[PDB]
Amino acid sequence: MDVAGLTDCGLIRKSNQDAFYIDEKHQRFFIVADGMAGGEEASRLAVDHIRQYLETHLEDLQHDPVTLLRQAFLAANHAIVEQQRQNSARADMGTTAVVILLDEKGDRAWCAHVGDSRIYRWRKDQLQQITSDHTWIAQARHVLSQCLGREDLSQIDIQPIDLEPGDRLLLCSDGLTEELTDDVISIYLSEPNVQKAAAALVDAAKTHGGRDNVTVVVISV
């Protein structure tokens, strides 16, 4: 499996409040977080706490990935809520998170998210959005109806997806998808080398205006 990850502040925002992590050692899990300097702290806490929770508990709990991912996400949630106290006027910081946890065999991806960061799967020039955005509109802009850093955290969406060789998975913040249509994203995911695809996605988000922080993780199965 090949994986590439890239974050970019984009062409308009002053700071990058997105964060990501790839388990480069074992390629088991992948995390993107879009914060809202409260946002930087929230996305960093989410990525670090989800990463550490998964590192610590993966051996013990990979047989129950939904419990593992819920507890990782709640560990992150609590950590953000504790920093909200004092802590100060970072009162309201929050972050999205999207996580892929691969099973040991590597052909099942547990997709977990809170917010409007996305997971997509690409296959043979067709792209599918896997996560459903936690926005009031997607519910049927708002924007967010759910984020990490709330005592009122009400939903952690988790679903498995089975994978085939040659599939790609994309974790992205909305800085990608507010600039690039899915049709455009799909073309860049067709680039064989995932490092080039990741860079091309970011570069295209910027070519198209880059109005937000943009983060991608591209995984080729």
With 0-12 / 13-18 / 19 or more C-beta atoms within 10 angstroms meaning exposed / middle / buried, residue 205 is: buried
8 lines the binding site for Mg ion (CB under 5 A): no
Q: Which of 143, 161, 184, 187 contacts Mg ion by CB under 5 A?
A: 143
Q: How far is the CB of 112 from a copy of itself (least distance, A)?
A: 14
Task: Tell whether 179 is in a known binding site.
Answer: yes
- Could you report how far apart the first and last alpha carbons of the chain are, in Å? 5
Q: Which of 7, 10, 16, 17 contacts Ca ion by CB under 5 A?
A: 17
Q: 10, 73 in Cβ contact below 8 A?
A: no
Q: 193, 167 in Cβ contact below 8 A?
A: no
Task: Name the binder of 174 from Mg ion, a copy of itself, Ca ion, none, CB < 5-8 A by kind.
Answer: Mg ion
Q: Which residues pair with 114 in a beta bridge?
A: 97
With 0-12 / 13-18 / 19 or more C-beta atoms within 10 angstroms meaning exposed / middle / buried, residue 173 is: buried
Report DSSP state, residue 64. S
Give the interface with a copy of itself as residue ranges (CB under 8 A).
52-53, 55-57, 67, 70-71, 74-75, 78-79, 82
Task: Name the binder of 22 from Mg ion, a copy of itself, Ca ion, none, CB < 5-8 A by kind.
Answer: none
Q: Which helix (H) or strand (E) holds 182?
A: helix 182-189
34 lines the binding site for Ca ion (CB under 5 A): yes
Task: Name the binder of 75 from Mg ion, Ca ion, a copy of itself, none, CB < 5-8 A by kind.
Answer: a copy of itself
Binding track over 35-74 against Ca ion, x by CB under 5 A: -x--------------------------------------
Task: Name the binder of 17 from Mg ion, a copy of itself, Ca ion, none, CB < 5-8 A by kind.
Answer: Ca ion
From residue 144, give the alpha-carbon distance in Å to each of 4, 14, 90, 164.
27, 21, 18, 32
Q: Which of 5, 29, 34, 114 contacts Mg ion by CB under 5 A?
A: 34
Q: 143, 198 in Cβ contact below 8 A?
A: no
For Mg ion, how many residues bind (rule: CB under 5 A)? 6
Binding site, annotated residues for Mg(2+)? 34-35, 116, 164, 174, 178-179, 208, 212
